[PDB]
């Protein structure tokens with residue numbers, strides 16, 4: 001290992017776990033850690049769906065920064081990243097179903113799913129969304145499409161879902177006096 | 179401390195945390211632990227709502243065992259326990275609103291809420307529940323009634339909600355071949 | 357002087373099963389999730405935070421027999437580790 | 445021979461805000477939840493499991509300024525600790 005850490009490697013800005021630390025974690029916890037596959041043979045997959053350009057709702061300016069950051073991070077962590085942009089709820093479902101059918105999951109130990117869009121209380125907005133005609137993908141549907149029934153390849157494997165979206169109109173705050 | 183541990187004390191069957199262990203936890207994690215109030219002055223509260231006898235749905239035989247176990251455990255942990263039985267969703271709401279208004283929360287560091295009933299996908303069943311006329315308390319309502327707006331006394335304090343209930347009709351399983 | 361606070365913070369919910377799915381109960385022995393929760397709380401409250409204990413409860417259900425259920429942690433806004441410090 | 449498996453297990457969701465509430469984004473700097481998630485993943489993936497990292501992300505939002513949000517962990521059925529072991 002180099003004297004000074006460098007971001008020029010495959011892990012970029014992600015701080016490396018040493019062999020001393022990896023064995024310490026293997027010792028501090030017995031059989032309560034998810035198994036990791038060999039780095040030489042594993043085919044880790046990740047999917048990013050990001051909606052920026054919408055038909056009827058405000059443009060999500062700055063989303064490109066999120067896409068860049070999340071893509072580079074998941075790659076740093078060892079995942080091959082699919083990036084899909086400006087999709088309807090129907091398109092999101094079709095893409096998720098296809099992702100769940102990917103052969104690479106069989107030789108993978110985990111997956112990351114990332115959704116970035118506008119959102120309401122009920123779920124995540126598709127590109128064609130409006131108040132008059134809703135275009136919503138529910139979080140419930142995401143779980144269903146990736147469970148043991150609909151995605152047997154990811155049985156016993158960590159499935160991490162990250163969602164950047166509003167969940168309603170409210171500012172999320174209340175006042176109090178000290 | 180006694181040579182052999184005894185369940186005759188206030189903590190009963192709950193394994194005690196020693197002063198050596200408490201300082202070790204205080205050291206292993208810096209400022210990322212919830213503060214605990216002095217044992218001499220704190221007024222910890224917990225609430226158990228359990229529905230066993232229903233108008234139109236099957237009797238929850240064995241619920242008394244759950245009530246006994248959970249009441250004794252929360253007491254062991256230092257909580258004063260309220261036990262309320264056979265309530266409609268409306269009754270559950272009124273009881274939860276009253277619990278959130280209890281003066282003791284101001285001199286408490288945490289709370290436990292325990293719900294035990296029949297349930298469906300949408301939420302927890304009240305005593306008068308039937309398919310024709312639903313009597314349901316949603317998990318969403320429970321959170322709302324105990325948040326910073328509706329329960330300012332529990333601001334910054336851990337609120338633990340435990341729910342024993344069905345969440346639908348399904349057995350929760352799928353088959354696979356080895 | 358008034359200050360802003362998060363409307364919803366420091367919550368943790370623990371449900372007996374996953375959405376859509378049943379939770380089991382014995383007529384003389386009680387509910388399996390409740391019994392298992394008590395046993396794990398009795399054993400691990402001294403050394404583990406509540407999130408860790410709940411995970412251990414989930415782990416105990418990992419291997420499915422004739423009847424199965426998977427307890428689920430929900431809507432978590434705990435910003436810190438909640439240790440019970442039993443005895444203190 | 446066929447065996448039974450839990451229909452839903454080993455999931456974790458992480459949302460940018462609590463239900464009912466907005467999530468923030470800057471036109472040139474991106475989304476605060478995303479930026480904060482990356483920074484924490486970069487720093488702590490080596491030493492902490494994903495649940496712990498998400499909690500740390502929540503903690504970083506604890507003190508509310510002019511604009512506030514509280515990321516929420518949802519529908520957790522992770523039975524074990526998920527360590528990324530970056531570099532391995």
Ligand SMILES: *C(=O)[C@H](CC(=O)O)NC(=O)[C@@H](CCCCNC(=O)c1ccc(Oc2cnc3ccccc3n2)cc1)c1cccs1
Pocket residue numbers: 060117118119164165166167466467468469470471475476509511512513
């Ligand atoms: C809702 O669906 C979307 C979610 C999305 O990801 O698009 N949200 C909105 O539409 C937002 C748009 C916000 C645009 C206005 N931006 C800003 O004025 C602004 C200013 C500063 C800033 O930086 C920081 C710095 N530090 C922070 C700490 C904690 C939290 C936030 C912080 N932000 C960010 C953004 C909404 C439109 C109206 C209300 S929300």
Ligand SMILES: *C(=O)[C@H](CC(=O)O)NC(=O)[C@@H](CCCCNC(=O)c1ccc(Oc2cnc3ccccc3n2)cc1)c1cccs1
Pocket residue numbers: 238295296297342343344345378379380381382383387388421423424425
């Ligand atoms: C749904 O709303 C309710 C939830 C509630 O808390 O009441 N559930 C039901 O109504 C159940 C009732 C189940 C009654 C039948 N009991 C049994 O046959 C039975 C047998 C053995 C047993 O013990 C064990 C032992 N080890 C276990 C390990 C893991 C999981 C479960 C284990 N159980 C318990 C119960 C339903 C009625 C129909 C379907 S579910």
